[PDB]
Scaffold this active site. Structure first.
Site, PDB file in Angstrom:
ATOM      1  N   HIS A 146       0.818  -1.213   0.000  1.00  0.00           N
ATOM      2  CA  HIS A 146       0.000   0.000   0.000  1.00  0.00           C
ATOM      3  C   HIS A 146       0.853   1.265   0.000  1.00  0.00           C
ATOM      4  O   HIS A 146       0.320   2.343  -0.297  1.00  0.00           O
ATOM      5  CB  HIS A 146      -1.034  -0.044   1.154  1.00  0.00           C
ATOM      6  CG  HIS A 146      -0.506   0.321   2.512  1.00  0.00           C
ATOM      7  ND1 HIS A 146      -0.231  -0.628   3.473  1.00  0.00           N
ATOM      8  CD2 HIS A 146      -0.312   1.520   3.107  1.00  0.00           C
ATOM      9  CE1 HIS A 146       0.175  -0.032   4.578  1.00  0.00           C
ATOM     10  NE2 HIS A 146       0.137   1.275   4.386  1.00  0.00           N
TER      11      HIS A 146
ATOM     12  N   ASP B 231      -0.296  -7.544   1.431  1.00  0.00           N
ATOM     13  CA  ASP B 231       0.206  -6.172   1.523  1.00  0.00           C
ATOM     14  C   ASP B 231       1.727  -6.139   1.609  1.00  0.00           C
ATOM     15  O   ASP B 231       2.301  -5.349   2.365  1.00  0.00           O
ATOM     16  CB  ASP B 231      -0.411  -5.433   2.712  1.00  0.00           C
ATOM     17  CG  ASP B 231      -0.279  -3.934   2.600  1.00  0.00           C
ATOM     18  OD1 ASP B 231       0.052  -3.441   1.496  1.00  0.00           O
ATOM     19  OD2 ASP B 231      -0.501  -3.240   3.628  1.00  0.00           O
TER      20      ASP B 231
ATOM     21  N   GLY C 162       2.897   6.470   8.870  1.00  0.00           N
ATOM     22  CA  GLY C 162       4.186   6.521   8.239  1.00  0.00           C
ATOM     23  C   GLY C 162       5.150   5.457   8.691  1.00  0.00           C
ATOM     24  O   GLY C 162       6.321   5.485   8.283  1.00  0.00           O
TER      25      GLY C 162
ATOM     26  N   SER D  66       4.300   1.994   8.566  1.00  0.00           N
ATOM     27  CA  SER D  66       4.114   0.735   7.859  1.00  0.00           C
ATOM     28  C   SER D  66       5.418   0.353   7.174  1.00  0.00           C
ATOM     29  O   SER D  66       6.180   1.211   6.717  1.00  0.00           O
ATOM     30  CB  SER D  66       2.974   0.818   6.841  1.00  0.00           C
ATOM     31  OG  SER D  66       3.297   1.634   5.732  1.00  0.00           O
TER      32      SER D  66
END
Ligand SMILES: COc1ccc2nc(C)c(O[C@@H]3C[C@H]4C(=O)N[C@]5(C(=O)NS(=O)(=O)C6(C)CC6)C[C@H]5/C=C\CCCCC[C@H](NC(=O)OC(C)(C)C)C(=O)N4C3)nc2c1
Ligand SMILES: [Zn+2]
Length: 197
Positions: free
Chosen positions: A75, A99, A155, A157
């Site tokens: 993502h 993801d 911020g 991830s």
């Protein structure tokens, strides 16, 4: 057709320094140089450490080296290449269902070792170099010992969850939010990375 644009590369713009007794963020490239490196895909900067701060033209997040692969979230990165000294490097792993994406780890990076401790006392590392205790609550979830506004986690991830001995347990994917407060996090377990490999 002739005017169709190309998406730029993901660019390493800094790191979370975990080498010593103090965790701290370091910036290694500014916004203008980031924009130029993203368009060219050519990044000659020295890379160090396990946890990189990365950026596209529109987002910033983290990436973590485990087993010689720099991993992050789909993502954030989509299908993008990463900038490297010789030009753009194509993802070697892409899994939208998890993801998850990965590229060969840059020269100079250090890799974390996958955890085999079977321990549920974890630590989440954020883009601000906060080290957040997290109790593992399932295969892919952990609770924050001290809940935080989601602003604090935004911020981060792509960053690691670590065991007490510093092994990689997972990659931070999503925050579990109630009324804007993160009480828990979801992560990509390191075993899922190992299966993707
Ligand atoms: C496009 O293809 C895909 C494929 C798989 C996929 N799987 C997904 C799970 C997925 O979730 C979406 C992205 C992800 C997200 O914000 N992550 C980061 C982050 O920091 N991001 S980031 O670095 O700022 C950024 C934005 C890169 C620059 C860690 C959290 C920090 C703060 C939470 C802010 C508020 C959002 C709360 C969502 N909670 C949530 O959905 O919880 C569950 C329990 C899962 C319902 C959430 O956390 N979310 C939504 N999107 C995708 C998209
Ligand atoms: Zn361990």
């Amino acid at each position: 057709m002739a005017s169709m644009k190309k998406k730029g590369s993901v660019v390493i713009v800094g790191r979370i320094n975990l080498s010593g007794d103090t965790a701290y963020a370091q910036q290694t490239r500014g916004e203008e140089g980031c924009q130029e490196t993203s368009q060219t895909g050519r990044d000659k900067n020295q890379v160090e450490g396990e946890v990189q701060i990365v950026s596209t033209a529109t987002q910033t997040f983290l990436a973590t080296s485990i087993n010689g692969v720099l991993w992050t979230v789909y993502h954030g990165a989509g299908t993008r290449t990463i900038a490297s000294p010789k030009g753009p490097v194509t993802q070697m792993y892409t899994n939208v269902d998890k993801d998850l994406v990965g590229w060969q780890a840059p020269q100079g990076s250090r890799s974390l070792t996958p955890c085999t401790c079977g321990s549920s006392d974890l630590y989440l590392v954020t883009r601000h170099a906060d080290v957040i205790p997290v109790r593992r609550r399932g295969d892919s979830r952990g609770s924050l010992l001290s809940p935080r506004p989601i602003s604090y986690l935004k911020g981060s991830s792509g960053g690691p969850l670590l065991c007490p001995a510093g092994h990689a347990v997972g990659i931070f994917r999503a925050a579990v939010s109630t009324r804007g407060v993160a009480k828990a996090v979801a992560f990509i377990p390191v075993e899922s990375l190992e299966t993707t490999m």
